[PDB]
């Protein structure tokens, strides 16, 4: 409250200071289960363009 009002003395009352946010407990990554490497070698190493 002192940091929000930018004062070392706070008068009597109610003061909106910040918003409580629930912290993310885990991190989830969901990508498709495809595993075959993509043939960029065919594109980039071709003999003739």
């Amino acid at each position: 409250t002192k940091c929000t009002l930018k004062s070392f003395t706070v008068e009597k009352g109610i003061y909106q200071t910040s918003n409580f946010r629930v912290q993310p407990t885990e991190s989830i990554v969901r990508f498709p289960n495809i595993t075959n490497l993509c043939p960029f070698g065919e594109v980039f190493n071709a003999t003739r363009f």
Binding site: L37, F40, G41, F44, N45
Partner: protein, 125 residues
């Protein structure tokens, strides 16, 4: 066309010295790293050593005592002066370029062009 040709294999006595060549065509050694790899009849490809463009040599630490890799940039060829060839030194010796710049495939051996390799055998006669 980038093509690696090796020469100098054949019969060689135990305890002698034998010089191998990697006369290269289609590219020069001023900007490429070059490696020597051996191949046993019953085992896989075993890396022998590597010559860098600045003259820096690295070797197999179980094989440092008896190999020597040198260049001849005037003849754009690589040399391998091997000494004290024993029974397990019978191998087919490939000379290959290192694909430092790009990795198109996930190569286990990390080389983009290979040589045909020359076969060396060590026995009584």
């Amino acid at each position: 066309e980038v093509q690696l040709v090796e020469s100098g294999g054949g019969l060689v006595q135990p305890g002698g010295s034998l010089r191998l060549s990697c006369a290269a065509s289609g590219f020069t050694f001023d900007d490429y790293a070059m490696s020597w790899v051996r191949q046993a009849p019953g085992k896989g490809l075993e890396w022998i050593g590597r010559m860098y463009n600045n003259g820096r040599t690295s070797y197999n630490p179980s094989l440092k005592s008896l190999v020597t890799i040198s260049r001849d940039n005037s003849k754009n060829t690589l040399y391998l002066q091997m000494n004290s060839l024993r029974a397990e030194d019978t191998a087919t010796y490939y000379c290959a370029r290192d694909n430092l710049g790009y990795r198109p495939s996930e190569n286990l051996y990390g080389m983009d062009v290979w040589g045909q390799g020359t076969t060396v055998t060590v026995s009584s006669s």
